Amino acid sequence: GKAFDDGAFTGIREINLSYNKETAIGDFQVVYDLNGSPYVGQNHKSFITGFTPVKISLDFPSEYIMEVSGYTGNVSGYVVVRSLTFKTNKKTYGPYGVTSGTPFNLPIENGLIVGFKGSIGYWLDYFSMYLSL
Amino acid sequence: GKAFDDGAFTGIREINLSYNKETAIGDFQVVYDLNGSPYVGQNHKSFITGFTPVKISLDFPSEYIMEVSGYTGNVSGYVVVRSLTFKTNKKTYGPYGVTSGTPFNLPIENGLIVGFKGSIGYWLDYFSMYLSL
Amino acid sequence: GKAFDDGAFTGIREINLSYNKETAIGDFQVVYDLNGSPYVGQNHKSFITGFTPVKISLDFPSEYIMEVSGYTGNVSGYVVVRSLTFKTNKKTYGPYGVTSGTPFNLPIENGLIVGFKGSIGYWLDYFSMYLSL
């Protein structure tokens, strides 16, 4: 799919993603914090339509993500990110997508997610996270 | 004076400042790097004008600041930053301003200046720097 | 289990662990680097004995861990780390133990594991990793 790399920021204000309850994650976009101002990340769009949008608006800076988890698995012969869940110090958002395949998780004991990169084709193919203190 | 705080970025592309050879540093503006793209910082301006402007354009990313030095002293009963010098791994820029009073210097063996904060009235009153790997 | 926390160091020179191919990971001890010198970590020992010891001797500093993975599963009523694999930039060490249950993995694109904490009872219950540039 199409590679994307937002880089690193000061924190996260909002995540806007789309998903399909029979397939996987589609679109992915993040509003970061950048030294106290919202930084509107590029909308990384699936090649296909038919997804349900969700807006995860965080009470920044008191609310921050403590664990990202999900499943990766086969969709149409491709290994993609099928599901995501975001757990903050205040609540759990998701699972979004399909909770099937190989689980993964990144709990954070200390530190913050400050950035995302990855690739999206029909679906989110893979992603990585920038971490900072 | 008026406090400013740019916060932290991924690097420095350009420093714009102004000075007068009989008083002190006046204006200060940085073009930062943010994840490989230029980010034009706020222009922090003296309450007065008539300064001589200077543009320091670094060969980013290979050229970076290794030492910031200067003098603080008295101008019209105010302690201000009277001069600045920026030394990079390739060239020295300055001194700009008046080289008298109390010297200060921040040499860096490892790491980068990634942001500035401070306060400017008629002249630059004080400043601090964000440092990162 | 008994909690442990080595804290953070400069890097990793050697990992000593023990396992049993019928149960799970038993003991865990790391020889860290501390500013170019070896630092012998506390040896975190299971309450029971009978495990097979293994020594992973890394070619420090050129060789470093890029991914830690394994499985968590129930052993005699305890949910524990049943298996570990360490992948470096040079080679794969493991899997050690029993590759059965729920998988986890921590791949690192940039940065270093510089410390471990966790809990060991009869077996390795859980662990976390300090990461640094």
Partner: peptide, 16 residues
């Protein structure tokens, strides 16, 4: 060093 600041990055999860 270069003039570009560095950050820890964990991942990728998904397709290899």
């Amino acid at each position: 060093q270069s003039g570009i600041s560095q950050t820890v990055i964990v991942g990728p999860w998904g397709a290899k």
